[PDB]
Amino acid sequence: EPSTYPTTPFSKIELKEVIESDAQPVTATHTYLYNSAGRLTGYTGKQSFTAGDELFEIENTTTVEYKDHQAVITDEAGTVSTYTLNDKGYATTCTSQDMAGNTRTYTFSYLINTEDKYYLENITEKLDDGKEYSFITIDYSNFRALRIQQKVDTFEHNSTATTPSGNEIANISEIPSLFITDMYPLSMHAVAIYGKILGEPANYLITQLIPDSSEETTTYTYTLDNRGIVTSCHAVVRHIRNGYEQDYTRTVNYTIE
Amino acid sequence: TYPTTPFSKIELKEVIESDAQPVTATHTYLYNSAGRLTGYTGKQSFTAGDELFEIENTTTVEYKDHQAVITDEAGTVSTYTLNDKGYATTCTSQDMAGNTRTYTFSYLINTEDKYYLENITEKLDDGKEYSFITIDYSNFRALRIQQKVDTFEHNSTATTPSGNEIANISEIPSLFITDMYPLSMHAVAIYGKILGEPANYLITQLIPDSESEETTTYTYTLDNRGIVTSCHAVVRHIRNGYEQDYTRTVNYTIE
Amino acid sequence: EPSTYPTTPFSKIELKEVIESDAQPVTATHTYLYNSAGRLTGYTGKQSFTAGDELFEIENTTTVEYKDHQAVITDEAGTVSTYTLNDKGYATTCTSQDMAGNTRTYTFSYLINTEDKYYLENITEKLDDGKEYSFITIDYSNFRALRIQQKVDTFEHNSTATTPSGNEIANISEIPSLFITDMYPLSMHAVAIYGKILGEPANYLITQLIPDSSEETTTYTYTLDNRGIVTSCHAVVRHIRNGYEQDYTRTVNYTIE
Amino acid sequence: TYPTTPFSKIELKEVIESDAQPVTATHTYLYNSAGRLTGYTGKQSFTAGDELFEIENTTTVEYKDHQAVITDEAGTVSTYTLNDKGYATTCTSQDMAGNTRTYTFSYLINTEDKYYLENITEKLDDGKEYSFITIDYSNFRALRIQQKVDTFEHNSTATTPSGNEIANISEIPSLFITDMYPLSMHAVAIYGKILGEPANYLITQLIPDSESEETTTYTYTLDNRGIVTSCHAVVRHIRNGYEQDYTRTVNYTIE
Amino acid sequence: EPSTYPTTPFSKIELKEVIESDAQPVTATHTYLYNSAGRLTGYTGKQSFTAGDELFEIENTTTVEYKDHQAVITDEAGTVSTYTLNDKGYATTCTSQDMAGNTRTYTFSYLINTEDKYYLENITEKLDDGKEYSFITIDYSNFRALRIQQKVDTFEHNSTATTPSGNEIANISEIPSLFITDMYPLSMHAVAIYGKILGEPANYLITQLIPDSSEETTTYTYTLDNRGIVTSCHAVVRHIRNGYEQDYTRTVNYTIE
Numbered sequence A, C, E: 001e002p003s004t005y006p007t008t009p010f011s012k013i014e015l016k017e018v019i020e021s022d023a024q025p026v027t028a029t030h031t032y033l034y035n036s037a038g039r040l041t042g043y044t045g046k047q048s049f050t051a052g053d054e055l056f057e058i059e060n061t062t063t064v065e066y067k068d069h070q071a072v073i074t075d076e077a078g079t080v081s082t083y084t085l086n087d088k089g090y091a092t093t094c095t096s097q098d099m100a101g102n103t104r105t106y107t108f109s110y111l112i113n114t115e116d117k118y119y120l121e122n123i124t125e126k127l128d129d130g131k132e133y134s135f136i137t138i139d140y141s142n143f144r145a146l147r148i149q150q151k152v153d154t155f156e157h158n159s160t161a162t163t164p165s166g167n168e169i170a171n172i173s174e175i176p177s178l179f180i181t182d183m184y185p186l187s188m189h190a191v192a193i194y195g196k197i198l199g200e201p202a203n204y205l206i207t208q209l210i211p212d213s214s215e216e217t218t219t220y221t222y223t224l225d226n227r228g229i230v231t232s233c234h235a236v237v238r239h240i241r242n243g244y245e246q247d248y249t250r251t252v253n254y255t256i257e
Numbered sequence B, D: 001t002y003p004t005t006p007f008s009k010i011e012l013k014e015v016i017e018s019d020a021q022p023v024t025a026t027h028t029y030l031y032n033s034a035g036r037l038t039g040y041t042g043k044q045s046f047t048a049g050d051e052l053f054e055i056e057n058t059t060t061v062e063y064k065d066h067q068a069v070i071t072d073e074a075g076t077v078s079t080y081t082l083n084d085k086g087y088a089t090t091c092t093s094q095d096m097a098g099n100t101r102t103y104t105f106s107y108l109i110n111t112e113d114k115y116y117l118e119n120i121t122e123k124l125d126d127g128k129e130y131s132f133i134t135i136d137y138s139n140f141r142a143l144r145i146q147q148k149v150d151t152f153e154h155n156s157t158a159t160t161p162s163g164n165e166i167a168n169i170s171e172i173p174s175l176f177i178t179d180m181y182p183l184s185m186h187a188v189a190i191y192g193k194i195l196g197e198p199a200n201y202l203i204t205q206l207i208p209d210s211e212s213e214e215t216t217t218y219t220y221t222l223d224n225r226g227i228v229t230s231c232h233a234v235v236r237h238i239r240n241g242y243e244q245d246y247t248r249t250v251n252y253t254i255e
């Protein structure tokens, strides 16, 4: 039978990161839960830190509900994102409504591969008046790289996400890149992205994000288990401004099971 | 019925100082006693955070009737269709979205029936030509290279100095050919001579067509056999009216 | 008898520098050889480093051949620079031809002193179409400073090279400044420059290179032997960008004999 | 007519944190399709001063009628005289002063005609016995080891836990045997089974004879084939009334 | 014909080292010269540094003269060391006399290998009254290590000099270890040691010097050329005092030709 929705072959995808501080370090946890059919059912964010001599844990939950050709994603703040899905279970449009009654509308378009798996090529954000406010386009033409174009109001930026030829890592982890959920407007759809509602992740892990040039490259180093599934990602941001280099590192631990 | 390399191993080692911390890269090509490439191991050594990292990936090469099947650890299967002389005429592999990517190859056939790559064309799943590289051998001391990637076009000349030509007894390809897209996707097939024979003389300069050119100069060290032990690559660059050259040093173990 | 060519009273001028690295430091050697008549006959570049546990030395040689009113300089890559000399042996024009058949043309003009020694005042580079692509002009009007104007395509920059009044060091070493062979297009003629084919070096050593102003000054400190001949040069580049100073140091050892 | 290893490669990798800067050590043993050891490559990676260092040395193993000749890059020739079953009975090599050093070996012969080393004796050029190691297999779960180096004598017991024995399908020797003088001089011959078969079960403890013993405990990780992927070695040590244990972690690639 | 003296197959063995300072660094050079027969003929020590802005070079020369069964070594200070040699050209005794008329006497004993090459096993120093003041003994029994016993008056210390099994480097450079000429009383005979008058160096390079235990290990890392001859030695001294480690590094460059 042909599939009617994208699936994740895991029951849980969990990310853990320490957000550094010389006074109050915070451990952030992002937990994505999938049902036995492989659809995302919910997301829980957690922040853990010490205050006085006591450990505190702050939680926020996002719910995912499915209807015929629809995914309804509701966060802790009461914002409802309604995704209209095609026959294959990928969103073609989204309407987001906050508790103040403000709305945002999005369209999505895809590359459809030989197996009928969909890969996001375009996210466009419109305003109430129908004015296009932002977009991200992804081009899969380069054999081992993704060409990314971003526009946020008057800001425009192009970048390339690369996989090393001869050193490719298969994305059997089925995870998105760390940078993708931080890019506006995809940053508004992180829960839909981990649920594959906005398309499949690339078939190989990305090891470099190169913005167009002052230069600011991101390098990703992965640790895998004996199944070839990601256990951690080391991200190194190298920012250069007229021969002055400042390096920032992130370590994200993964529990994919 | 097939091209051969008279060595059992071709290994490249390089310290890359370009990154925050220096990375050591190793590229090892292994050949069987018949002279056919059987495998490739790519290695990277560096530290990331507290963790010392050693990334090691192995690609296998299998030969069938008029075929070379190149399989990596990521599960990519690249199938090269070979002609009667053992050089690829076609290649199918899988892209970032899992679609089939097709490559065609055409050659210069010399008097000794040795094939030299003249054209690599890359076609997308819809049949659209995405990129090509053409090589003109009219003057062996000045190879005319045309590259087209999407809408962008780059022409360059690869030269050998008249009277100071070094015989390529090492049977190695130039450093620049495995960095030029789409040939940069076929480094394993290139070192296996599946995509043609390397230049008969070592190339000492890569000159782009002109602006004060960002030319690459190659300097080689040879052993007592006349086989390459190291290559120094200098890319000239002008920054605020001053020469600021980028350099690479690659050590070779050819045995 | 009046001289027909410039001369260097040494048989060898050799520069040695360590190009720093926390993994693969490289020792670079630049050797200029002069015949007993004092004309430059050749240049050898050498790079020495460790790979594994073995020392490697990479060499490149440039040849200098003389004919009536001509100097032909050929590098390791096969590029031929043909200098047309005046009656005093200084180049008035140069044509450079690479192995791909690309050509570059240059004109040179000079200050002629009371002893008929020539000091470079202008290098102009033209393109095939006759379009002026770059130039460097040197003014010797200030008693103890050189005023330098550089143009490379659309880039324009002015700088001053100074000698300290009361602390002058006679240039009996007959060497050019370190910065002169790094400035484009003089950087294309380093072998001709050390051979005095492009003029005499200034009579006193330069201790400061001050570009016009973000500021980026170079200071030179020399060590001499008991003959008053240079044995080393310490070059300190001080780059300032809105109160943020980054200092870069070079040590070049000289063997002038 | 000779012992065999059913793998083509046995590789050990270790990060040594004992030194000022961490050293990465690699020991690679290669076997031919017949199962005989053909060579060894020892590698060390570290930084010394500004220079990143990579020391790499290769030892070759050649077989002749009733002989195994082990040659290193330093020009040492170690000649092992083999019996009819392919195990060494004698060895001649060259010491620090260039004198011939002689070793004799004797074995336990099991029911399947497999040989297990019981004695290694080292003799100086004058014929003086300088050292020996004897191994008693009376109890396979508690091997009695006697070592004598000059005047100093050390007795220890190598144990396997009753009911929790791991089959040595990996065909690897213990980590401690190639550290025990004079067996520490014959690591290449040991991995080639030239000096006998390894223990049928992995050894989990090395207990010296007693004082609160400086015992070594080995913990192994196996893959789905039951072949070793890593070994963790813990040496217990008491310093000012506190436990201060020394640890080693060795990763294995047995294929 | 059987040899009557030890030989070095080089004409020069030269060591260069920078003795660090944040004010007046000194470059020290130790040059050992051998005649075409392979006997040491002389030693020159050189110290080079900057004072003011001038380079200064301080030199001291030691002469080596040979007679039947004798080597006479005279330094810059006028101290004469007379070595009595055996039939193979190795010293069995030495008498040293300074300009004040003070004398020191030494005996030497050796391991004689199958090729009749001699390796030092014992140096004993006596006083005028015949009282043994110091000794160094070297044992070659361990296949890949040297066991060293030292006694200087009431001070006694044992150490082990090791070669790594499976990673041996042949001593085709024919050089002694760096530590051997720093150990008293062998430190009084450095010129005789480089001339092989006090025996052959070990057949493999030493990579570690381990004193008996507070611990103080020396590690040696060598760089070789394509002939397998030493070009440099990196020596790292690791001193530990109750969990407090202080590391000292030396880099000695070699010119062996």
Ligand SMILES: [Cl-]
Residues within 6 Å of the ligand: A156, A157, A158, A159, A212
């Ligand atoms: Cl951009």
Ligand SMILES: [Cl-]
Residues within 6 Å of the ligand: B153, B154, B155, B156, B209
């Ligand atoms: Cl072009």
Ligand SMILES: [Cl-]
Residues within 6 Å of the ligand: C156, C157, C158, C159, C212
């Ligand atoms: Cl300006």
Ligand SMILES: [Cl-]
Residues within 6 Å of the ligand: D153, D154, D155, D156, D209
């Ligand atoms: Cl005991």
Ligand SMILES: [Cl-]
Residues within 6 Å of the ligand: E156, E157, E158, E159, E212
């Ligand atoms: Cl002691």
